[model samples]
Target: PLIVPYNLPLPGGVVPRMLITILGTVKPNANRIALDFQRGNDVAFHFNPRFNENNRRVIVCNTKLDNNWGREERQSVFPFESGKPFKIQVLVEPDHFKVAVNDAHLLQYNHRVKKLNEISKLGISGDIDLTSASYTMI
Candidate 1:
């Protein structure tokens, strides 16, 4: 897959460009949470991470690519009018990252850090929305 990081840096947050070829968990210390409305097959999100030896992490999505026939369309989820913009947020504690979307909706992903560092990049591909975004280290 092709990934392009936004000119906007996440600063306090870290992002990585990754390709997942596995069908299961990519990291031993990673966990994820997801949600749906009216329970259908159109929108979703996931948090992923890697452990044991390498530090690979990511957020996964289950939403359809939005458009076809050579059009630009990619998003975490689309609720067919019943859902809002699907706001998503994350908070990283000492060793865990807590994620929340639409307020009460939340999840977690992990990474094994042998050194102290700050998350710095956000990987993007296909079509995406980076407009009106913000992040901070907490």
Candidate 2:
């Protein structure tokens, strides 16, 4: 289960102005990776980077509730590299979640679950080697 979903409990919960960081390495033959900020059965922020879904290009960000995914947000700028380490930081704001990859600013997703405090879990899924995953409230 090395590359399976890891549901880490957030002791303080993900309230507004909180921050979370995930550090990992991309697999050599990686397909995609999903960093999920979850609230029980719902996914508040789904940061999905597709490495080879469409010929190793494109990143789609979206949310999921009750097993249904919302509209996909595809954009340019793929900063991930295969077999290399990467860091992902997510900031919880009042209206949206801001993310940065490898110290560079990424994208922001609007609040879907409403109460950010409801997000009590940091889940990771897909094809990647996770080294360390941590969250801090600020």
Candidate 3:
């Protein structure tokens, strides 16, 4: 399994029609997991699944600019279960990111950072065992 807090440089950076995929298993007592598309210290897209908030689960998406996080876009659908493996696919579109979990479409996040090509890294962390992570042009 890949190590936690994994950071990989994206080849050729992010662009339209790109597909990014991650496969991992959530820890049995996981509270949260974060996947980020980054440009230097700034996060272009932040995909987070939180399990321990007010006894309710939700996926929160946002961006971080200049060390401050932007307004969060929350989704009520909870598609992840503890101790289960999942496949997350992110399709990079011209204006937004289309994300699906375990082969089910989940949410669309509009681009907060307009320059897609500037996003040059992918980072994953929190309570999960990462098995695979990669990106492909589509």
Candidate 4:
């Protein structure tokens, strides 16, 4: 089984036109899940889906730099369900990242950190069963 809190190193780092894909299942009683693109101690992208925040489901996106988090961008269109499988695609663009969930367009996050190639790791954690995670250049 692919374990939780999994970290995968990106050898050449990320770049424009690259696509990252994650397949997983939300836990039956999941509260939250976090996916991150990391550069050393900094988080270039922090994608978090909260199942029950303030009694509502939301997707929170943010960036962390120098141990401090920036303003969060939250979306209320919850496309994920408890105990259901999901496919997430993150398409890296020149200025922003386009994300899709279950083959449907979800949201876009602008580049907060300028150096895309510096982001060398992909991290996954929280309440979900990860099936596979991969990336490809297009």
The candidate scoring highest on lDDT is 3
Q: How big is the positional error of residue 70 in model 2, measured in Å on the Cα after superposition?
A: 1.3
Candidate 2 on 47-121: residue-level lDDT in tens?
888887647577898888999999989867888888999898888888888888999998888887886767888
Error of 2 at 115 (Å): 1.8
What does the lDDT read for residue 27 in candidate 4? 93
Worst 10 residues of 3 by lDDT: 7-16
Considering summed lDDT, which 10 consecutive residues are worst modelled in model 1?
Answer: 18-27
Tell me the spans in candidate 3 whose CA falls farther than 4 Å from its real position: none
Model 4 scores worst on lDDT over the 10 consecutive residues at 5-14
Q: Write the per-residue lDDT of candidate 3 for residues 109-136, one digit (tens) a residue.
A: 9999987888999999989999999988
Candidate 4 regions exceeding 4 Å error are: none
Task: Quantify all predictions' global Cα lDDT against the true fold.
Answer: 0.31, 0.82, 0.94, 0.93
41 in model 1: Cα distance from truth in Å?
32
Q: Taking the tens digit of each residue's C-alpha lDDT, what string does model 4 give over 33-98? A: 999999889999999999999899999999999999999999998899999999999999999989
Error of 1 at 106 (Å): 2.0
Q: How does candidate 1 fare on TM-score?
A: 0.39
**lDDT minimum window of 10 residues, candidate 2:** 1-10
How does each model score on TM-score?
0.39, 0.90, 0.98, 0.98
